[model samples]
Target: VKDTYTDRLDDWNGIIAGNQYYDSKNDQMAKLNQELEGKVADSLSSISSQADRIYLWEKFSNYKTSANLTATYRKLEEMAKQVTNPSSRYYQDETVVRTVRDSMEWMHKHVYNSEKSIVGNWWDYEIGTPRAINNTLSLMKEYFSDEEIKKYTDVIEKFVPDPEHFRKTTDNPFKALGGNLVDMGRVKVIAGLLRKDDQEISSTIRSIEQVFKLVDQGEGFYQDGSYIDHTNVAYTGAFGNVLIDGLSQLLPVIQKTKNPIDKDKMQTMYHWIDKSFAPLLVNGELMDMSRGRSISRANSEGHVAAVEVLRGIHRIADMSEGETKQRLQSLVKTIVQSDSYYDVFKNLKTYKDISLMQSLLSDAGVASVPRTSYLSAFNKMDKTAMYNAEKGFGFGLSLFSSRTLNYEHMNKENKRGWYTSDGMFYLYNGDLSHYSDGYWPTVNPYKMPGTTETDAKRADSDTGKVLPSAFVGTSKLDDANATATMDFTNWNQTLTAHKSWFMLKDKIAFLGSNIQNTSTDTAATTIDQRKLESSNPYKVYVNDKEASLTEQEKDYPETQSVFLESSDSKKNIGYFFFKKSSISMSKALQKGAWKDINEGQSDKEVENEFLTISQAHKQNGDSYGYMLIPNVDRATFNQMIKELESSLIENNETLQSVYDAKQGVWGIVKYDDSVSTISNQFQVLKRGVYTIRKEGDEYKIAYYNPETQESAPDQEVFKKLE
Candidate 1:
């Protein structure tokens, strides 16, 4: 279904004809143009009214512009005359005074108001306006009277309570957000104008006291008289400008005051001025917020404030003593000697021809000539000008270079043996132990390697002799035998073993252990039985006093007896010393009574064979000995005694002579009836023999020849016997 729709049109809508549309019925273009012109004219008139006559005169004095110098000069001359003569109608004329005061007030108000308009607040906007007001006040002091100043003072006091307004507010905008630049400007103007008037000056001085209270209450100043807020404010600039201005205003009152409290306050203010401004300086250049950021390294505002503060400190320093005086002196030196200023001035030439120079001059209240005094060299420049240009390019560079070198020298002297870089100086401890190569030459070993006095003395004492190589004789055991054996009976023990024993002989003697332990059962054996299982065959000995065996046979019989009592007797006993087949009857009988005495005929052969084998293997040498005994079972006491005599033999002499002399007899045994009873009396005596001979360096029993006949030297005797 179709629905009816209502259409609405805009009230300001235009009608379209051909290709153009119009909204308003009236053509008001001419009216708007006329209104715009009126506004422009009003702005011009306001600008003209606010312009200072002196500023205008100075500006026109250049005469470089197309303006007529003659006319400008006439105007300045007429105004100067009117203001100078009190009798003139312009003198004491409230309207004329008001006009001049209003103009200054307007300038202050306009600049501050414009700043506020841009920044949306009045707090801290006095950075530019206070200086302007101070400039205006200086002119007023020159040309205006008290009555003339009263008119403007009334207008300023309406918005701000003269010097009291500045005193009531904190200079730090962050804490005093309500502070206005106009109020600060009014205080500066009042203070500057009433600098000489006791009553008026006292009021300003009291206001400064109030201001100081606020400053003290802020985070910047401690009750102990230290200042921590080193920030730069647009109005304050290190707070030094405010401090200087306040001090200058209060100095006369302070000097006149008989009150101790007032004097103390002044002293406290001076202390704040001293500490707050001291750290802002580096190599004679003032540091500011910009110096720490992307702006000017030597901020002009900070410079102006520092110079002013320093001047204030100098004034008070003259009156102080001891610590205060010393501290002030140190602060001044630090300010003048730091390197921050030097770095800034290095590139000052670039700022010379820029607009910043003029702006700096204007802001600083410095006249073109030196005769016209200002607060500081810095204040003579424009507020917006770069600090490098305000301090002339060449002048700045020279000043920085000079101060930097001076600071470096002083730093070097104070921190003796120290090196400086990037505003820091590195110092070394005086002691050699604490010294480092980077900071101290004394401790660096490598730096004075050969020249070290201690090292040189040690070398001289030692004669510079170096020790021999440590690697010698490290491989002497590589070719030593894997295994070794010793046979004391065979006389084949190596000389090395004897040498080892000789070396240890003294120790062994002191220790009192038997060296013969290598062979004898009574002595401790060197080799363990378990360890000797895989060793080469070798004979060892233990001498038996009543035995007939030779030295070589002693180990065999003893070992066999010990082994036969064990399970593995064959391996334990090894080989027998004498083979049964090696013995002979002649050799056996020569040392024995009978081969088979008292044995049955059937057993007689066996007894004879055993005796013969023993005799056959017996060694016969002059240095050897042996013995034999008769069989105890069959030989009677008389028979054994008779047989013992036959066992003895002489060295081939006549038998009758041998028997008559009783030298020796064969087959005869000694019978001691007192020593032996009848039950043990039927015994045969066995002769034991031993021969001593040299073995190596010592005498030893070489062998024992047991046979009765003279011992024979037979090298092949044991071959047929075995």
Candidate 2:
């Protein structure tokens, strides 16, 4: 908070110092502002890339004064020369008989040929290059002489991709629907305005009706706060930010025009920001490892994405009238004033190219959100998994099936075992940078924590090779109590584990049964918790004894449970582990270069001094019953696990059963079909998972889904399974 005050921002409205915002039209203010603004404008001509140049033009044009902006004429001269130069990669590369208008013929031909070419079009030529170049030229029109501007007019005119071409590609589609069409529509809106061509402009606006349909259909964002992209991946954090960032930039300027993307759509987007997006983040931290391709990189970009989107949403709020405007205005203001604002916007140098707050002075909104929570199971949507969090702690489980979402090949996210098909649990007590400070590449991707199998990753993984599962689904149970039952059985890999979690306020009881890896592959389920590598470990214990390891660096073993404390500078945290399999405690140093494991950015390696207390079983039938308590200290945690002796309802590995006798909950996941009672209170008749906690009368049932878990007994329907 003090830092934000020091680096006081003069947002043209004035130097914001908390509640008050206004421009102090003082000469001294103008002097400092001009130096910064001059620095922004002077560098404009030198930005040679497509996206960077286009991004700046709006801010650059708005900040423009009639006064000479350092060699501005010469810069325009150079831009014109590039368009005309036949040798340039950015050149239009066509016969040059130019005019106020050229053939719409070229546009039609590009639609047909470019989709199949070696230098396949759009992402390179039209979308980023020509569109950015032409828009930049249009903004600097005053600086260029008539002939100089005219040199590139035909090149600009030729940039449009015909709407008919896209319609033909989809056959029955009325308009382009996904992010592709959304941007293509925006590109033309900007491009057409330059050419003064009403046909391309009209076709685009007419196709504007498709904007709602695109978002309304397919595996995309929904009202329930469930967002999926890249086909079925659970990705509100990763791609949702990408989706909104563009919409906010595009729609706000065009709201007054005929048939702007209907205003209510902004409300839907706002709901996602409030409910789905906001609740998932850990006080401006990345949500989970399942953030699609964003997790592939070593450094997290989602923070920047989230901030940029909020900046845009602030604009959407203002353009929108009534309560939508009122709520968001307060919301945006609250965000810009909070600690997250300081955390994100502090290092001005790292903001790289994007300038902040040119936009209250700039209408575009770009900032981070506030802190909050949502307890209970939120729909996993396309991923066939569940994400549940309390006021402070949260966990995301990635269960797999042929229908469930899997790892992406793009963005170098090839380290498949992190959170994909493998039954992985990304546990968080709100520390977002867990992997950022360590030798992430050195840690065992297989043993980090959670269940299931893994084979070595060949960097040459075929793009078409399926990184998928046979079937997986989850059941959400709410009976004034919350629980999630899931069957994570991958037929592709001979592994089956019936998993269930009781989302209690202070802790989560993780129970799994019928655990089997039918292959030669060695299988283990982890009580694996903590970013213990770099965090300070003051004390650790096994049982009721103060079994602190005198040798902090040696491998030690044998235990039913273990408890430890990490006095991390960020939070007071500890881990308690209980096991049903062979438990080992060891501190071993694992070393490797990130180039060996990192798909995001490679050529990096380090020595990872790490620890593990996990359960490994060699038998075909092995089970795990573990409890994790976040926000607990060494004393509170150690004292609590001692109570496990009386609390044990059932922990029978042979029966494939686990139950909390004190909690009145029990269940069984079978190896072969039919009912078996794990507890005398109830009995089951099928070969699948069946957990229930009896209230006054009704049995609060959380039956595992059988859609993906086919072999696990036909959906057990026992009105009274006794």
Candidate 3:
């Protein structure tokens, strides 16, 4: 057996430091060299000048600034990387090693040491600081004496004592949940690696069984591939990556020990990647709908977060064999090929990552999996339906219910996210920069697309509570088509609406009924508010005629169809109105600072041109119906607009339904707890989401009660021509 301290430490050093086989001349390594040069110089200056008492940075001394503590530790980790990395110019330089050693000692003694008092965010004390410390320790283990290594280990032990429980700043201490739980387990395993304690590693692995169990409520992965964090946010892309990264990091460490991960647990982890995560990615971009507050951060965009997920998945794939390895590596290859915006090779983090990705990319035996088209109803997280088509159109509709929070507004981020979950839709197509290109800061918060809300304003970070309604979910017919329903009642009880989405092959038909509001502010349904490309010069066509529009909003009364076409005609969008209504359109240069939406973000102002389409409500109990078609030609747009009205079978207070004769699909949203008719051939006996498809002489039907989370069809009746 290999010695844990000597041999395992060498293995981990190679994982972090990049060994002789690493390409020192590659662009990624060159990029790392530049980063290391900057950070190491910063570290040495802080140590040489004694920047501050008890902390290296002056701003880090405050007890509430836990993020600053993690930042300090990260800089120290970069110094450690430069000291050991063969690709770096400072590799094995005695001066740099001394600087790293001294920096670690200073931080340990005054900041993260066991003798120090705990302050600031509990997450920093437990997960953030400890993780960075362990990474630095693994890299510089050979350079330090055994006694000094033990001192750092003691600091990790003091902050994260138990694998299950964690310290709470003001409230009572409780067991960790979701990503937090996995992070604690990871902290324990690495500490065990540092001390060469096999039992510590083995026992910590077993204690994390709760994380693998499927939970119905609270924080964990639900059966429907939904992952929830903070008890309410749908976080498959943000904090969910933390859970997967923790698992992937632990996989390489524990596999060499006496206790490896159990086979069943390994299978469960694979299932999470395939089910919970894989569906959300289109090409290489993780859908922002499920990303929660991470959408507001300027740096953490869709493809950036996707890179992290791909890296973690690659680490897990590297340790597997047979079909598991083939399936995962294939997915990695697909994302690498499909993503044209970012270079996956240039962004990979570790030496082993480069090698594994190179192998996956070169292997002819490994096939590339195409991004599949499907519709998902993530009911557990209160998200209705996310539709992706093979034609490169994605419609992500956000929904809220009593079981989910409207938005996460803590940590001074996502301040204008009050209406993100109120049936707001994010459209993705050939335009890769649609949402990622400063859309959040520049768009009007009060007029998010597909949302029916009043013009009342909200304070910064003032988000509403969990909505007081259930029956929020979708009935998916196979994979390509579905219908979503939301019984929406705002937290203040000021507004209520019955919203439904009829997702077809290339279009989404939306209906809003029973829109009631107590506020005197004017309420309206925003059809879309999208960023205009530089190639298109404020172009918006009304009824096949280009309107001479300016920054000010213009009213087009009795509007039949509104169209927006890219200069290249690659990302055309058309809106079909069932009734002639007054469409309010605007093309304007909007400017806002990122700090306005997120306190921690940069205050730099961003400017973008946006095209907005809004139809205001005339009174309290108003209803509206419209359809959005993406990437369609002018001929099809006109023909579809003429045919769309007939497809909208019923749109009223009690029920909303649609029928697509081309696809033989019937979608129904029964608002009341009573029977609802579908053309004359079929009827739903109870209130729920239903999809009926007619196949030559045979009929396929699916029923789901979103509130109960049930798929049984105990309430159904059907009739056909005899």
Candidate 4:
């Protein structure tokens, strides 16, 4: 019954639209088809006639019956052939060389137009603005009319109102405008373009001369020809361009004027250009520090400016001498070899966004497209510029988000990441010993130190230095009063006594101390065992008789020497041992002796070996005296005093008595408890050890005064030590 089926009739009955004819479902299908055809016709009529015709042609051509379409295609072919012929009036054909020239001219015009748009009332005539205008003028020289040139020049002249006094300023109008360099460079370019010997050109030249005078009022180039400033501002590359280019434009005009002042000014400008641009070349590459951090490699603008300046200088300067000529040649070679320029050109060729170079080389210019190498340099510059722009944007973004993503929180996150990867014990609430089990886990008893239980299974117990005490315990020392007992015989014990020695009778005397304790020791039964635990501790011992103050003074002399004999007579000789001195001079010398001995014997065995007996004896005596010299050399003596003063200050000790053993002179001492407040002040003093002594209640330091020669107190020499 559930699988039973039922049938129903398909209910569709239609009447024809125009003629009244009732139809069953089968007949309704025919009527529906007719209605669809009518709707399709209406939709097709909505399309343009031309489009409809094209569609009909495409469809009909597929069936090879479109004669009209074939005829239309033949006509277009004929027209294209006629237009391509060189002799035809509509000829499009030209040599690849001609095509490139046309393209360059087009680019030049486009760039000039774009640059023109940014200069007027909207933007002030800043340094960069003038540079842009000058660049446009350069590009337009071959294509633009005299009137068009005059239009832009007038705008530039108006924008730079006071050419002589133009400068970088923080005020509204001047601040909006870049600076004087733009106006200076622009005026120079304008003068060059006019090729005029008229009053206007001379007046402009005079204004520029005034600016040069203003610049000279400040410090000129340093002895090394370097620019100096509080900010260490150096405009070697930028200024080089202004100087050289300005001189090139004004030199002939100044000569024509017969004005000695103008000639002298031109000469000065030429000299400045030479000095600034020449030194930047090292093995044929521009070195402008302002361009980038690199001293040898230059950025795009720097390289270009350098080359331009060098070319200008070469044209003007007379370098007949071999050295001068050679230097000039070297500078030219650097400009040619500047890879940074080539890189910039290359980027320019590929850069999608239109740029000044592209506009300069467009169809507006007669000059051919630059060579591949030149273009490549421009491309490199584009990449560098893009990178710098992106870096600036990123810096801005970081500043904006600094409050939300604070540096302190970032530092904490970095620290957490480091500890997580390294598996170090993390201190919570300043309690490092109470670390989480995740950070420092309790090890299995059977595993060796630094080896996991998994490693123990892979390694042989006999060959590996595995011990039961290697495993860390999980027991927490919560009770302060609980006693910890350490059993020496237990292999599971984690603490043990370490013995240090002090030789009293030419043999080592063992002095034991418990540096670590891991057991429950309830009773204090162990003799001569004291608890001491630290990451690093000073372990030293003296003779048992000398341990007590009464017996120490009775048996032990103020200075004692114990000789350590070496078994390997050929390899080692002897070692001298003496009581640690309280006197600063002896103590300081002994410290130095110990450091030298330890460093020298690092590779040798430490088992009672005298590695250099004779060397050690000399070092302990004469070498010590040499180190104590106050005036062996001016520089060396000054250096030694600094070190001694630093050491005394570090230990909170007074710089009291001083003496120079080399000259057998006593130094005048100056004491200032406040001097200790200064950190590393001794670093400022002279080198050499001085005998520091106490005369009655006052402390005095002595130094060998080379001028005085005697052991007399010299405040002048003492102050030099200070």
- Give the best candidate by lDDT: 3
What number of backbone clashes does candidate 1 have, counting pairs of residues 3 or more apart or in separate chains? 45
- TM-score of the candidate numbered 4? 0.29
Task: Report the candidate with higher TM-score, 1 versus 2.
Answer: 2
Over 4 Å off, model 3: 46-54, 59-64, 168-171, 384-389, 536-538, 714-722
Provide the clashing-pair count of each candidate structure. 45, 17, 0, 70
Name the regions of candidate 1 deviating beyond 4 angstroms.
Answer: 1-131, 138-142, 162-204, 210-217, 223-237, 244-250, 253-261, 273-276, 285-308, 318-722
**TM-score rank, highest first?**
3, 2, 4, 1
Tens-digit lDDT track of model 4 for 1-722: 01100000000000001111212232332333344334333323432235223232233233122232223222222222223323333244343223223322332343222244332222233343344443333332333354554554454555444544443222433321112432453454343343332444445555555434423213223322433221222334444444554444334334434332444454454345454444344222343332221111112323343444555554353322356544444434333443322322321111111122223224232232211110000000100000011111100000001001101101111111111100011001111111111111121112211110111122111111112211111110111000011111122333332211111111111122233334443111111101111332212212211122221112222321112111211111111122221110000000111112122112222111001111111110111001111102233334443433322111111222222222222322122213221221121122211233334434344332211122344342333223
Each model's lDDT: 0.25, 0.47, 0.78, 0.26
Question: RMSD, each candidate, Å?
Answer: 52.3, 10.5, 2.2, 33.0
Q: What tens-digit string does per-residue lDDT give for candidate 2 at 1-722?
A: 11211111111011111112213353333333334344434444444335323222333232123111212322332333333323333234232112101211222233212343213323433344444444444433333344543344454344345653342322232334445555665566555544545576667766654544324335565654566565666666666665555565556444534445665554466666675565544434445543665654555443444464565555466557777676666565544444232244422111111233343323444333443334423344433222333334555655544454555555345454344445556555545545445425666665656654433233434331233433234434442234444556643556767665544435556666667776666665655634554545535666535554421433334455555555742334444435533565566666665555444366656665555656665666566676766656666666766665444344444234444544665544443345565445555565344556777556666665344433233335344544
Q: Sort the predicted structures by lDDT, highest score first.
A: 3, 2, 4, 1
Cα lDDT over the full model 1? 0.25
Instruction: Tell how far residue 21 is off in model 2, in angstroms.
Output: 12
Each prediction's TM-score versus the true structure: 0.28, 0.70, 0.95, 0.29
Instruction: Give the distance in Å from residue 635's predicted Cα in candidate 3 to where it truly belongs.
Output: 1.7
- Local accuracy of candidate 1 as per-residue lDDT tens digits, 591-649: 11111111111121211111111111121121101121111111132233243233222
Model 4 gets an lDDT of 0.26
User: Pick by TM-score: which candidate is best?
Assistant: 3
RMSD of 2: 10.5
- Return whichever of 2 and 4 wins on TM-score: 2
